[PDB]
C-alpha cells in the first residue's frame, strides 16, 4: 500500500534521497522549486505534510533557519541531519561571520557524506527495504564519483591564477575548494541583511584589479546585484548558477548531478 514516506526540507536532498530509495519509497521536498530555502517561511500545509513521514531529512549546518521551530509541531517522526561528518567551511564575513556554511552539498566528495547519512536513515527506519537502499546508495556514489574527471576537465581551459569564481551569495566555497577557485559574493550567506550595497563596491574593485571576465547570480535570488556589478565593471553577467534549489522535473536542472554539471559548465563557459 502506502510507501515508506520520506520529506525533506528542500529539493536537492529530495532528489539525492529519491535516488538511494529508487521505487521502494517516496521522497518530497517541503520547499518547491525556485523558492529561496534559509528564511523559507513555513506553512499549515508544511506542517501536514512532514507530519505524515516516516521520516524527515534536513542539512544543518543551520541552513534552513526555520526548521528547528517547525520541526516542535511535528510528533513521532524521526529525523536526520543529512551533513553528518562534513567538516564545515566557516562564514567568512558580515553578521554570520564564522557560523558554518551550509553549501556543503556543492562539493561531490561531500556528496558522498550526505548519500551514506541518507542511506543509514532509511535502513535504520525501514529495515524491510534495506537490502534495495544498500543497492541504490553504492551505485549512486559511483555515479557521483564519475563526475570528477569530467568537471576537472571542463574547468581545464582556465589558467591557476584567473580562476577566480565571482557569484552572488557566497553559496560556492565547497565547490572552489574543490577545484581551486577563489571566491567572491556580493553577501556571504542569504539573509535579510545590510553591507550589500558597499560590498558590491568592494567586489567591484577585486573585478578591476584581477581582470576577472565574469561575474554570475544564483536561481533562488535576484539577478540584478551581479547585472549591476557587470554594468559597473568589464565582465560579462555569466547568467544563473543553480545552488539551493533544483529546476522544475521539466527544467534545465531536474537532479542534483545536474545542478553539479550546469554550474560548472556555466561557470567554465562565461571564461
Ligand atoms: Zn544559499
Same mark, same amino acid.
Not at 151 to 169: C, D, G, K, M
Not at 172 to 194: C, H, M, R, T
Given at each position: 500500500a502506502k510507501k515508506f514516506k520520506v520529506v525533506t526540507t528542500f529539493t536537492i536532498i529530495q532528489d539525492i534521497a529519491q535516488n538511494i530509495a529508487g521505487?521502494?519509497?517516496?521522497?518530497? /521536498?517541503?520547499? !518547491?522549486?525556485? +523558492?529561496?530555502?534559509?528564511?523559507?517561511?513555513?506553512?499549515?500545509?508544511?506542517?501536514?505534510?512532514?507530519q505524515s513521514a516516516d521520516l524527515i531529512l534536513w542539512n544543518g549546518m543551520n541552513l534552513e533557519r526555520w526548521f528547528?521551530?517547525?520541526? *516542535?509541531?511535528? !510528533?513521532?517522526?524521526? /529525523? +536526520?541531519?543529512?551533513?553528518?561528518?562534513?567538516?564545515?567551511?566557516?562564514?567568512?564575513?558580515?553578521?554570520? /561571520?564564522?557560523?558554518?556554511?551550509?553549501?556543503?552539498?556543492?562539493?561531490?566528495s561531500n556528496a558522498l557524506i550526505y548519500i551514506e547519512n541518507i542511506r543509514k536513515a532509511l535502513v535504520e527506519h525501514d529495515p524491510a527495504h534495506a537490502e534495495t537502499y544498500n543497492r541504490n546508495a553504492q551505485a549512486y556514489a559511483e555515479k557521483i564519483?564519475?563526475?570528477?574527471?569530467?568537471?576537472?576537465?571542463?574547468?581545464?581551459?582556465?589558467?591557476? *591564477?584567473?580562476?577566480?569564481?565571482?557569484? /552572488? *551569495?557566497? +553559496?560556492?566555497?565547497?565547490?572552489? !575548494?574543490?577545484?581551486?577557485? !577563489?571566491?567572491?559574493?556580493?553577501?556571504?550567506?542569504?539573509? *535579510?541583511?545590510?553591507?550589500?550595497?558597499?560590498?558590491?563596491?568592494?567586489?567591484?574593485?577585486?573585478?578591476?584589479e584581477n581582470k576577472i571576465p565574469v561575474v554570475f547570480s544564483e536561481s533562488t535570488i535576484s539577478d540584478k546585484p551581479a547585472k549591476q556589478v557587470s554594468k559597473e565593471t568589464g565582465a560579462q553577467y555569466g547568467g544563473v548558477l543553480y545552488v539551493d534549489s533544483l529546476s522544475g522535473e521539466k527544467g534545465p536542472v531536474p537532479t542534483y548531478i545536474s545542478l553539479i554539471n550546469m554550474t560548472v559548465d556555466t561557470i567554465a563557459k562565461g571564461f
Open positions: 521505487d521502494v519509497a517516496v521522497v518530497e /521536498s517541503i520547499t !518547491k522549486p525556485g +523558492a529561496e530555502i534559509h528564511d523559507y517561511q513555513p506553512t499549515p500545509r508544511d506542517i501536514v505534510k512532514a528547528e521551530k517547525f520541526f *516542535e509541531s511535528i !510528533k513521532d517522526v524521526p /529525523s +536526520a541531519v543529512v551533513t553528518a561528518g562534513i567538516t564545515p567551511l566557516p562564514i567568512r564575513e558580515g553578521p554570520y /561571520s564564522g557560523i558554518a556554511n551550509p553549501h556543503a552539498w556543492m562539493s561531490p564519483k564519475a563526475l570528477d574527471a569530467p568537471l576537472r576537465e571542463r574547468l581545464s581551459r582556465i589558467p591557476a *591564477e584567473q580562476r577566480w569564481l565571482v557569484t /552572488s *551569495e557566497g +553559496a560556492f566555497s565547497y565547490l572552489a !575548494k574543490d577545484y581551486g577557485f !577563489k571566491e567572491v559574493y556580493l553577501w556571504p550567506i542569504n539573509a *535579510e541583511q545590510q553591507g550589500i550595497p558597499q560590498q558590491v563596491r568592494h567586489v567591484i574593485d577585486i573585478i578591476r
